[PDB]
C-alpha cells in the first residue's frame, strides 16, 4: 500500500467485473522500480490514494496480464517472471512466486488458453513456457536471434501462440509439433494481436507504423512511429485499437480503416483495454501518467 | 587474483546494487547509465518535450567511484543502423547523449554491441564522439564468438539451421569487429569484449581473435555446468579458453541471472579464482619478462653506441647462456690440445667484445674444467666497460688476462689467436653487425683458428597482431617521416599475436669467412604457406647460432634454448595490413644492404599482394658501422 506511484505507466487491463489493473515503472530518477495497482473505480485512477489495492515491486514492470480474476503475471526488468495474487478481500496484492529464469529484461508475457500456463519473451532472445501451478519452466526455446518483442497466446488453442523479434521473424508456434516454431512471411514487427472471432487470423504492427492483417495481405499506414500494441474490442464485429510511440491512439475497422483518433496523450501510449461493461469505452495509459477514457463512436 | 566484473541490465538503486556487487567479490559493475527501456524522442512532438530528469543524478556516487567502478552500457533500443530513418536519427542523438553522459561521469569504459553485420553508422557516431575532445576512456565492443543466428535452436520447422560447414561463415563475427574498427581507423580507445557462448566454435574461429585487442571476456551464467555438489563449473573445453584468456590478462565479466539458486552468487566468481590459482605460474622466464609483453624497444646497437652499466648487467643475469659458452670453449680446448700436450700448449683466446667480463670468466672456467692452459685477451671498445675490466684484471684475473681498449677491426694484435669468442649477436642475429666486426678481426686469427660462434642464422615468420600494429602506429614523432615508424624493427616480447606460418631461415653467416670475395649483403625470398584467414601486420624475427659443434644458442620458438633469458624477438612491421585468405601463400622479400658507413634491412611483401619496399636506402633505419 504505497502512497506515490511511478510516473511511467506501462499496462492497463480490465477484468470481468470491471476493476482496472495498472502496472507502472520508474524509468528515471533515483529509484528504478515498479508497482501494481487495482482500481475498482476506474475514474479514480491514477490517483494513488483512491485505489482498491497496490504494492511495490523490486524492479520495473515491462509487461503484465491477468491470470483469471485474482492473478497478476508480471514481466520484470530483473529478468524474472512474477505472479502476484489478490487476497480473498482484494485489499492486498501478495507475491505468489518470483523466479529468475531469464538472463535479461523480460519484455512480454501472455497467458495461454487453459489459464494454467503462460509464455514469456525476453531480450535474452529466449521464449519460455511456464507451469503457473508448479512455478517452473516447462520449456525454453531459443528460436529467435534478437530481442523477443512480443508473445501472444492463441485465444482458444492452448498449444498455439505467436511471437515476433528484432530478427525480423514472425513465428507461429504449435508445441504439438516436433519443431514447434514456423516462420510466417519488411520492417521489424513490434506488436501482435490474434483475432478474437477467427482462428487462423491475426494482425501485427511494425516499427514503421504499419498495421497488417494476416491469414495463416491487407495493410495500412496507421502511425508515424513504432506500433506498440494492438487490442481488439469485445464487440461481435470487433474494432482494432492501435497505440504507438507517436503518442496517438487509433481505432480501425475490419479493413484497417480509421474510425477514431485520439491525441490526448503527451508521451508514448503504452497500452489499451476495452471495458467489459461499456463496450464503446476504451481506456489508454501512457508515460505521461494519464489514464484517458475514450468513448469510441 | 582475477579482475572480474558483474554485468547487469537492472539497477533499482545504485548504492544498494554496487554494495551487493562488491560484497560478492567483484571489482567493477557494468550497468546502464539510462534506463534500458526509457526510450527517448529527439525530433517529433510532443514526446520530445518529456519533462526530466532524463536519468539518475551523478551525485549518487563519488567521482572516484564513477572513475573506477562503473562501466556504462548503451541502451539496447539504440539502433543507429536501423533501416527506418526516424529510428536512425533518434539513435544517433541518443547515442551521443549517452556517450557524452558517460564522458561526463568520467567512466573508465563504455559498452557497445556488435550484434549485426552493418554497424557503419554506429561507427561514424562513435568516431565523431572520439574526435570530440581528447580522452582516455575506453569503448568495449560487445561481440560474440558465435552470432546468435548461428547458435539458435533448430526448432523452426520451415527454416532449419545449417548443418554443413561454412568455414568463412563461422568467422562472421570477427568480420563484424574488423570492419567496425577499420571504419574507426584503429582507434586505440576501441577494444573487444568477447562474449562466450554455451557451445564453442571451431578452433580456427577462436584463433581468429589472436592478436586482437581483447580487454574483457563475457561469461553468461547459462554456460556454466553443475557438478555433483551443486556448484557451477565449466567444461574442459571452456576451461581451455579461460586459461588462454588469463594469459591475456583480460577482465572477466559475469552476465545473466543466478541459475544455481541453491548456491550464492559469488560461486561463479569463486570458480574463476579457482581456475586462476590452478596453472603453471611464472616459470623463471615468464617471471623474467612479465612486464615486457608487447613492449616495443629500440634494438640495441652496441657498435655505434656505448652500452650503459645496467645494460651489461642484464646480459650477465643469464647463467644458462654463458654456461653454453663455457661448454663450447671447453669442447674446443680439448679438440685442439691433446692430453700429452696439456702442459706445453698454451692456447691464445681472444674475447672480441668482452663487455664487463662474463665471457672472460667463462673462458677461465672452461680452461680449468678442461685442464688446459690459455692466454686471454679481453678486447672491448666501450671505454666505460673497460673500466670494469681493468679493475677485474688487477683485483682478480692478473697477468693471465690482457685488456685491450680498442675496436677489434683496428686493433693490431701482438700475436694471433687460436680461438676468438664473441657475443655480437642481436635478436635478428646479424642486426648488430657481428659479420662486419668479425670480418675485420679475422686477420689475427690463426689459419686453423676457431671462431665462437662459428655461424648464426636469422629466422622470420609472418604474424598477425592488430594490437602491435597499433602500437607501432602510435610511434609517430614530430620531425621525421610520419610513416618512418613502420620502416624500422623493434625488439619486443611478442605476446598478443598469432604466428601465421612456421619460421624459415633468412640470413646466414659463417666465421671464419675463408671465402676470398666477402660480401655481407643479402637478398632472400621466402614463401609462407598460410592455412587460415587472417590479417598480416608484420614479421617476427629470431636467430640460431652455433657456438661450437652441437652447443647452440637459439631464440627460435621450436628450438628455443631452454631456460635462457637473453634476447627477445624482433619485429619488422609493414605500413598497411594485408588480408590473407586460407590457403594463400605470403611471399616476403628481405635485403641486407650496406655502404661503407651503415648497414640496414629492406623488406617487401610480394604475395598475395605487393607492399611498398620498406626502409629504402635506410631512409628510416640504419645500423651504424
Ligand atoms: C655483449 S654486447 C657486445 C659487446 O661487444 C662490444 N663490441 C661491439 N663491437 C665491437 C668492436 N667492433 N670492437 C670491440 N668491441 C666491440 C660492444 O662494445 C659490447 O660491449
Ligand atoms: C632491446 N635489446 C636488447 C638486446 C639484447 C638483449 C640481450 C643480449 C644478451 O644477453 N647478450 N648480447 C646482446 C647483444 N649482443 C644482447 C642484446 C638487443 N636489443
mmCIF file of C-alpha atoms in Angstrom, chain A residues 6-296:
data_model
loop_
_atom_site.group_PDB
_atom_site.id
_atom_site.type_symbol
_atom_site.label_atom_id
_atom_site.label_comp_id
_atom_site.label_asym_id
_atom_site.label_seq_id
_atom_site.Cartn_x
_atom_site.Cartn_y
_atom_site.Cartn_z
ATOM 1 C CA UNK A 6 5.782 5.657 -10.662
ATOM 2 C CA UNK A 7 5.477 8.184 -13.486
ATOM 3 C CA UNK A 8 5.762 5.808 -16.460
ATOM 4 C CA UNK A 9 2.525 3.846 -16.865
ATOM 5 C CA UNK A 10 3.129 0.620 -18.786
ATOM 6 C CA UNK A 11 -0.032 -1.527 -18.697
ATOM 7 C CA UNK A 12 -3.775 -1.287 -18.044
ATOM 8 C CA UNK A 13 -6.115 -4.288 -18.188
ATOM 9 C CA UNK A 14 -9.788 -4.649 -17.275
ATOM 10 C CA UNK A 15 -11.169 -7.850 -15.769
ATOM 11 C CA UNK A 16 -14.660 -9.358 -15.797
ATOM 12 C CA UNK A 17 -16.402 -7.196 -13.195
ATOM 13 C CA UNK A 18 -14.695 -4.025 -14.475
ATOM 14 C CA UNK A 19 -11.874 -3.378 -11.976
ATOM 15 C CA UNK A 20 -8.832 -1.778 -13.614
ATOM 16 C CA UNK A 21 -5.310 -3.170 -13.209
ATOM 17 C CA UNK A 22 -2.346 -0.806 -13.535
ATOM 18 C CA UNK A 23 1.347 -1.516 -13.984
ATOM 19 C CA UNK A 24 3.816 1.343 -13.547
ATOM 20 C CA UNK A 25 7.591 1.668 -13.830
ATOM 21 C CA UNK A 26 10.037 4.302 -12.595
ATOM 22 C CA UNK A 27 12.171 4.742 -15.719
ATOM 23 C CA UNK A 28 14.125 7.729 -14.360
ATOM 24 C CA UNK A 29 15.256 9.290 -11.112
ATOM 25 C CA UNK A 30 16.962 7.791 -8.096
ATOM 26 C CA UNK A 31 14.993 4.530 -7.814
ATOM 27 C CA UNK A 32 14.162 2.386 -10.864
ATOM 28 C CA UNK A 33 11.305 0.218 -9.621
ATOM 29 C CA UNK A 34 7.681 -0.627 -10.398
ATOM 30 C CA UNK A 35 4.293 -1.128 -8.815
ATOM 31 C CA UNK A 36 0.926 -2.822 -9.306
ATOM 32 C CA UNK A 37 -2.461 -1.205 -8.712
ATOM 33 C CA UNK A 38 -6.146 -2.146 -8.730
ATOM 34 C CA UNK A 39 -8.880 0.468 -9.230
ATOM 35 C CA UNK A 40 -12.391 -0.852 -8.664
ATOM 36 C CA UNK A 41 -13.288 2.745 -9.594
ATOM 37 C CA UNK A 42 -11.511 3.321 -12.940
ATOM 38 C CA UNK A 43 -12.305 7.053 -12.922
ATOM 39 C CA UNK A 44 -10.288 7.447 -9.701
ATOM 40 C CA UNK A 45 -7.030 6.239 -11.279
ATOM 41 C CA UNK A 46 -4.254 7.083 -11.451
ATOM 42 C CA UNK A 47 -4.792 8.941 -8.151
ATOM 43 C CA UNK A 48 -2.825 6.699 -5.813
ATOM 44 C CA UNK A 49 -4.954 7.336 -2.732
ATOM 45 C CA UNK A 50 -8.324 6.405 -4.253
ATOM 46 C CA UNK A 51 -7.275 2.858 -5.210
ATOM 47 C CA UNK A 52 -8.500 -0.531 -4.043
ATOM 48 C CA UNK A 53 -5.067 -2.174 -3.717
ATOM 49 C CA UNK A 54 -1.420 -1.587 -4.533
ATOM 50 C CA UNK A 55 2.078 -2.901 -3.945
ATOM 51 C CA UNK A 56 5.671 -2.080 -4.869
ATOM 52 C CA UNK A 57 7.912 -4.339 -6.951
ATOM 53 C CA UNK A 58 11.690 -4.617 -6.769
ATOM 54 C CA UNK A 59 12.197 -3.684 -10.434
ATOM 55 C CA UNK A 60 10.238 -2.184 -13.319
ATOM 56 C CA UNK A 61 7.112 -3.618 -14.906
ATOM 57 C CA UNK A 62 7.816 -4.185 -18.597
ATOM 58 C CA UNK A 63 4.543 -6.080 -19.176
ATOM 59 C CA UNK A 64 1.756 -7.816 -17.274
ATOM 60 C CA UNK A 65 -1.520 -9.661 -17.767
ATOM 61 C CA UNK A 66 -4.409 -11.033 -15.745
ATOM 62 C CA UNK A 67 -4.371 -14.675 -14.636
ATOM 63 C CA UNK A 68 -8.032 -15.442 -14.017
ATOM 64 C CA UNK A 69 -9.776 -12.960 -11.737
ATOM 65 C CA UNK A 70 -7.252 -12.603 -8.883
ATOM 66 C CA UNK A 71 -3.874 -13.397 -10.509
ATOM 67 C CA UNK A 72 -1.382 -10.914 -11.973
ATOM 68 C CA UNK A 73 1.560 -12.121 -14.086
ATOM 69 C CA UNK A 74 4.411 -9.619 -14.408
ATOM 70 C CA UNK A 75 7.427 -9.348 -16.722
ATOM 71 C CA UNK A 76 10.147 -7.705 -14.639
ATOM 72 C CA UNK A 77 13.234 -5.758 -15.663
ATOM 73 C CA UNK A 78 15.140 -8.077 -13.298
ATOM 74 C CA UNK A 79 14.747 -10.917 -15.800
ATOM 75 C CA UNK A 80 12.171 -12.566 -13.528
ATOM 76 C CA UNK A 81 8.585 -13.584 -14.243
ATOM 77 C CA UNK A 82 6.437 -12.806 -11.203
ATOM 78 C CA UNK A 83 2.943 -13.962 -10.254
ATOM 79 C CA UNK A 84 1.021 -11.883 -7.717
ATOM 80 C CA UNK A 85 -2.422 -12.722 -6.357
ATOM 81 C CA UNK A 86 -5.126 -10.708 -4.641
ATOM 82 C CA UNK A 87 -6.304 -11.908 -1.246
ATOM 83 C CA UNK A 88 -9.880 -13.002 -0.586
ATOM 84 C CA UNK A 89 -10.650 -9.413 0.449
ATOM 85 C CA UNK A 90 -8.895 -7.919 -2.614
ATOM 86 C CA UNK A 91 -7.243 -5.247 -0.461
ATOM 87 C CA UNK A 92 -3.666 -6.602 -0.631
ATOM 88 C CA UNK A 93 -1.523 -7.663 -3.589
ATOM 89 C CA UNK A 94 0.746 -10.506 -2.462
ATOM 90 C CA UNK A 95 3.654 -12.088 -4.314
ATOM 91 C CA UNK A 96 2.918 -15.695 -5.264
ATOM 92 C CA UNK A 97 6.256 -16.619 -6.844
ATOM 93 C CA UNK A 98 9.266 -14.816 -8.320
ATOM 94 C CA UNK A 99 11.535 -16.987 -10.484
ATOM 95 C CA UNK A 100 14.653 -15.564 -12.158
ATOM 96 C CA UNK A 101 14.814 -17.691 -15.309
ATOM 97 C CA UNK A 102 15.620 -15.106 -17.999
ATOM 98 C CA UNK A 103 19.104 -13.620 -18.348
ATOM 99 C CA UNK A 104 17.892 -10.148 -19.380
ATOM 100 C CA UNK A 105 14.817 -7.917 -19.207
ATOM 101 C CA UNK A 106 11.584 -9.876 -19.609
ATOM 102 C CA UNK A 107 9.758 -7.796 -22.217
ATOM 103 C CA UNK A 108 6.499 -9.651 -22.951
ATOM 104 C CA UNK A 109 4.193 -12.138 -21.240
ATOM 105 C CA UNK A 110 0.917 -13.790 -22.223
ATOM 106 C CA UNK A 111 -1.424 -16.313 -20.594
ATOM 107 C CA UNK A 112 -2.461 -19.332 -22.660
ATOM 108 C CA UNK A 113 -5.965 -20.678 -23.296
ATOM 109 C CA UNK A 114 -6.219 -23.042 -20.324
ATOM 110 C CA UNK A 115 -5.201 -20.261 -17.941
ATOM 111 C CA UNK A 116 -2.730 -22.643 -16.277
ATOM 112 C CA UNK A 117 0.326 -21.874 -18.450
ATOM 113 C CA UNK A 118 1.955 -18.715 -19.779
ATOM 114 C CA UNK A 119 4.606 -17.757 -22.329
ATOM 115 C CA UNK A 120 7.208 -15.031 -21.798
ATOM 116 C CA UNK A 121 9.634 -13.257 -24.111
ATOM 117 C CA UNK A 122 12.861 -11.526 -23.145
ATOM 118 C CA UNK A 123 15.797 -9.562 -24.523
ATOM 119 C CA UNK A 124 17.941 -12.649 -23.853
ATOM 120 C CA UNK A 125 16.367 -13.939 -27.099
ATOM 121 C CA UNK A 126 14.632 -16.756 -25.209
ATOM 122 C CA UNK A 127 10.964 -17.729 -25.020
ATOM 123 C CA UNK A 128 9.818 -19.828 -22.065
ATOM 124 C CA UNK A 129 6.639 -21.791 -21.357
ATOM 125 C CA UNK A 130 5.613 -21.700 -17.699
ATOM 126 C CA UNK A 131 3.599 -24.002 -15.445
ATOM 127 C CA UNK A 132 1.888 -21.439 -13.224
ATOM 128 C CA UNK A 133 0.785 -24.111 -10.741
ATOM 129 C CA UNK A 134 4.192 -25.781 -10.338
ATOM 130 C CA UNK A 135 6.058 -22.445 -10.663
ATOM 131 C CA UNK A 136 8.587 -23.981 -13.067
ATOM 132 C CA UNK A 137 9.679 -23.538 -16.671
ATOM 133 C CA UNK A 138 8.296 -26.351 -18.818
ATOM 134 C CA UNK A 139 10.204 -25.441 -21.990
ATOM 135 C CA UNK A 140 12.843 -22.901 -23.026
ATOM 136 C CA UNK A 141 13.030 -22.060 -26.734
ATOM 137 C CA UNK A 142 15.816 -20.119 -28.461
ATOM 138 C CA UNK A 143 14.213 -19.745 -31.891
ATOM 139 C CA UNK A 144 14.941 -16.055 -32.495
ATOM 140 C CA UNK A 145 18.296 -14.328 -32.977
ATOM 141 C CA UNK A 146 17.481 -10.991 -31.298
ATOM 142 C CA UNK A 147 15.241 -9.462 -28.645
ATOM 143 C CA UNK A 148 11.800 -11.043 -28.368
ATOM 144 C CA UNK A 149 9.485 -8.062 -28.799
ATOM 145 C CA UNK A 150 6.076 -9.656 -28.202
ATOM 146 C CA UNK A 151 4.420 -13.001 -27.454
ATOM 147 C CA UNK A 152 0.662 -13.528 -27.809
ATOM 148 C CA UNK A 153 -1.126 -16.714 -26.790
ATOM 149 C CA UNK A 154 -3.778 -18.180 -29.049
ATOM 150 C CA UNK A 155 -7.296 -17.325 -27.800
ATOM 151 C CA UNK A 156 -8.625 -20.907 -27.875
ATOM 152 C CA UNK A 157 -5.743 -23.295 -28.723
ATOM 153 C CA UNK A 158 -3.696 -23.982 -25.590
ATOM 154 C CA UNK A 159 -0.556 -25.020 -27.523
ATOM 155 C CA UNK A 160 -0.502 -22.188 -30.099
ATOM 156 C CA UNK A 161 0.940 -18.690 -29.743
ATOM 157 C CA UNK A 162 2.690 -16.015 -31.788
ATOM 158 C CA UNK A 163 5.991 -14.223 -31.272
ATOM 159 C CA UNK A 164 7.941 -11.547 -33.135
ATOM 160 C CA UNK A 165 11.518 -10.383 -32.706
ATOM 161 C CA UNK A 166 14.003 -7.823 -33.961
ATOM 162 C CA UNK A 167 15.452 -10.623 -36.112
ATOM 163 C CA UNK A 168 12.535 -9.803 -38.453
ATOM 164 C CA UNK A 169 10.769 -13.126 -37.806
ATOM 165 C CA UNK A 170 7.086 -13.684 -37.101
ATOM 166 C CA UNK A 171 6.878 -17.170 -35.593
ATOM 167 C CA UNK A 172 3.692 -19.212 -35.286
ATOM 168 C CA UNK A 173 4.133 -21.764 -32.503
ATOM 169 C CA UNK A 174 2.466 -25.155 -32.035
ATOM 170 C CA UNK A 175 4.171 -27.161 -29.283
ATOM 171 C CA UNK A 176 2.314 -30.242 -30.556
ATOM 172 C CA UNK A 177 4.880 -30.337 -33.435
ATOM 173 C CA UNK A 178 8.413 -31.748 -33.090
ATOM 174 C CA UNK A 179 9.768 -28.434 -34.390
ATOM 175 C CA UNK A 180 7.216 -26.129 -32.719
ATOM 176 C CA UNK A 181 8.073 -22.846 -34.479
ATOM 177 C CA UNK A 182 7.089 -21.804 -38.004
ATOM 178 C CA UNK A 183 8.082 -18.631 -39.860
ATOM 179 C CA UNK A 184 5.262 -16.522 -41.318
ATOM 180 C CA UNK A 185 6.053 -14.464 -44.410
ATOM 181 C CA UNK A 186 9.988 -5.784 -44.441
ATOM 182 C CA UNK A 187 10.309 -3.644 -41.322
ATOM 183 C CA UNK A 188 10.723 -5.186 -37.891
ATOM 184 C CA UNK A 189 7.461 -6.441 -36.334
ATOM 185 C CA UNK A 190 6.694 -4.929 -32.936
ATOM 186 C CA UNK A 191 3.178 -5.990 -31.872
ATOM 187 C CA UNK A 192 0.812 -8.949 -32.255
ATOM 188 C CA UNK A 193 -2.917 -9.439 -31.727
ATOM 189 C CA UNK A 194 -4.923 -12.551 -32.566
ATOM 190 C CA UNK A 195 -8.394 -12.068 -33.983
ATOM 191 C CA UNK A 196 -10.965 -12.999 -31.303
ATOM 192 C CA UNK A 197 -13.535 -14.496 -33.704
ATOM 193 C CA UNK A 198 -11.372 -16.049 -36.462
ATOM 194 C CA UNK A 199 -8.989 -18.879 -35.599
ATOM 195 C CA UNK A 200 -6.234 -18.503 -38.213
ATOM 196 C CA UNK A 201 -6.267 -14.673 -38.430
ATOM 197 C CA UNK A 202 -4.047 -12.169 -36.630
ATOM 198 C CA UNK A 203 -2.746 -8.625 -37.055
ATOM 199 C CA UNK A 204 0.743 -7.256 -36.451
ATOM 200 C CA UNK A 205 2.290 -3.794 -36.437
ATOM 201 C CA UNK A 206 5.879 -2.898 -37.361
ATOM 202 C CA UNK A 207 8.440 -0.302 -36.277
ATOM 203 C CA UNK A 208 7.418 1.964 -39.187
ATOM 204 C CA UNK A 209 3.798 2.445 -38.101
ATOM 205 C CA UNK A 210 2.070 -0.028 -40.437
ATOM 206 C CA UNK A 211 -0.676 -2.414 -39.299
ATOM 207 C CA UNK A 212 -1.125 -5.617 -41.298
ATOM 208 C CA UNK A 213 -3.928 -8.188 -41.454
ATOM 209 C CA UNK A 214 -2.528 -11.692 -41.974
ATOM 210 C CA UNK A 215 -4.064 -15.125 -42.566
ATOM 211 C CA UNK A 216 -2.367 -18.470 -41.983
ATOM 212 C CA UNK A 217 -2.300 -9.399 -47.233
ATOM 213 C CA UNK A 218 -4.053 -6.190 -46.155
ATOM 214 C CA UNK A 219 -2.206 -3.294 -44.525
ATOM 215 C CA UNK A 220 -2.491 0.426 -43.813
ATOM 216 C CA UNK A 221 -0.079 3.144 -42.649
ATOM 217 C CA UNK A 222 -1.741 3.990 -39.342
ATOM 218 C CA UNK A 223 1.058 5.603 -37.312
ATOM 219 C CA UNK A 224 4.179 7.681 -37.894
ATOM 220 C CA UNK A 225 6.250 5.683 -35.374
ATOM 221 C CA UNK A 226 6.567 2.224 -33.828
ATOM 222 C CA UNK A 227 3.285 0.374 -33.257
ATOM 223 C CA UNK A 228 3.452 -0.524 -29.578
ATOM 224 C CA UNK A 229 0.269 -2.544 -29.093
ATOM 225 C CA UNK A 230 -2.839 -3.918 -30.769
ATOM 226 C CA UNK A 231 -6.065 -4.692 -28.894
ATOM 227 C CA UNK A 232 -9.300 -5.960 -30.431
ATOM 228 C CA UNK A 233 -12.593 -4.807 -28.946
ATOM 229 C CA UNK A 234 -15.134 -7.218 -27.412
ATOM 230 C CA UNK A 235 -17.857 -6.495 -29.993
ATOM 231 C CA UNK A 236 -19.237 -9.210 -32.260
ATOM 232 C CA UNK A 237 -17.641 -7.471 -35.245
ATOM 233 C CA UNK A 238 -14.585 -6.223 -33.335
ATOM 234 C CA UNK A 239 -12.729 -2.960 -33.747
ATOM 235 C CA UNK A 240 -8.932 -2.746 -33.650
ATOM 236 C CA UNK A 241 -7.220 -0.328 -31.267
ATOM 237 C CA UNK A 242 -3.613 0.539 -32.128
ATOM 238 C CA UNK A 243 -1.263 2.584 -29.947
ATOM 239 C CA UNK A 244 2.154 3.876 -30.962
ATOM 240 C CA UNK A 245 5.183 5.881 -29.875
ATOM 241 C CA UNK A 246 3.760 8.799 -31.882
ATOM 242 C CA UNK A 247 1.592 9.472 -28.792
ATOM 243 C CA UNK A 248 -1.661 8.695 -30.624
ATOM 244 C CA UNK A 249 -4.425 6.102 -30.423
ATOM 245 C CA UNK A 250 -6.272 4.817 -33.486
ATOM 246 C CA UNK A 251 -9.384 2.661 -33.870
ATOM 247 C CA UNK A 252 -9.667 0.627 -37.073
ATOM 248 C CA UNK A 253 -12.458 -1.449 -38.588
ATOM 249 C CA UNK A 254 -12.445 -4.795 -40.415
ATOM 250 C CA UNK A 255 -10.476 -3.383 -43.372
ATOM 251 C CA UNK A 256 -7.991 -1.456 -41.179
ATOM 252 C CA UNK A 257 -9.714 1.855 -41.976
ATOM 253 C CA UNK A 258 -9.527 4.588 -39.347
ATOM 254 C CA UNK A 259 -12.732 5.301 -37.409
ATOM 255 C CA UNK A 260 -11.338 7.202 -34.396
ATOM 256 C CA UNK A 261 -8.189 9.112 -33.468
ATOM 257 C CA UNK A 262 -7.050 10.429 -30.086
ATOM 258 C CA UNK A 263 -4.039 12.619 -29.299
ATOM 259 C CA UNK A 264 -4.888 13.228 -25.638
ATOM 260 C CA UNK A 265 -1.579 11.662 -24.598
ATOM 261 C CA UNK A 266 1.543 13.831 -24.464
ATOM 262 C CA UNK A 267 4.004 10.905 -24.309
ATOM 263 C CA UNK A 268 4.156 7.300 -25.508
ATOM 264 C CA UNK A 269 0.909 5.320 -25.441
ATOM 265 C CA UNK A 270 1.740 2.024 -23.750
ATOM 266 C CA UNK A 271 -1.497 0.024 -23.523
ATOM 267 C CA UNK A 272 -5.200 -0.014 -24.314
ATOM 268 C CA UNK A 273 -8.004 -2.022 -22.722
ATOM 269 C CA UNK A 274 -11.706 -2.219 -23.571
ATOM 270 C CA UNK A 275 -14.332 -2.035 -20.844
ATOM 271 C CA UNK A 276 -16.368 -5.245 -20.419
ATOM 272 C CA UNK A 277 -19.295 -3.193 -19.086
ATOM 273 C CA UNK A 278 -19.463 -0.388 -21.678
ATOM 274 C CA UNK A 279 -18.175 -1.820 -24.959
ATOM 275 C CA UNK A 280 -17.777 1.642 -26.531
ATOM 276 C CA UNK A 281 -15.416 2.928 -23.801
ATOM 277 C CA UNK A 282 -11.675 2.457 -24.371
ATOM 278 C CA UNK A 283 -9.064 3.211 -21.705
ATOM 279 C CA UNK A 284 -5.457 4.117 -22.508
ATOM 280 C CA UNK A 285 -2.364 4.766 -20.404
ATOM 281 C CA UNK A 286 0.968 6.317 -21.317
ATOM 282 C CA UNK A 287 4.248 7.579 -19.917
ATOM 283 C CA UNK A 288 2.601 10.984 -19.372
ATOM 284 C CA UNK A 289 0.882 9.458 -16.298
ATOM 285 C CA UNK A 290 -2.507 9.931 -17.994
ATOM 286 C CA UNK A 291 -5.398 7.469 -17.767
ATOM 287 C CA UNK A 292 -7.731 8.575 -20.574
ATOM 288 C CA UNK A 293 -11.238 7.154 -21.057
ATOM 289 C CA UNK A 294 -12.190 7.318 -24.737
ATOM 290 C CA UNK A 295 -15.767 6.985 -25.989
ATOM 291 C CA UNK A 296 -15.378 5.294 -29.385
#
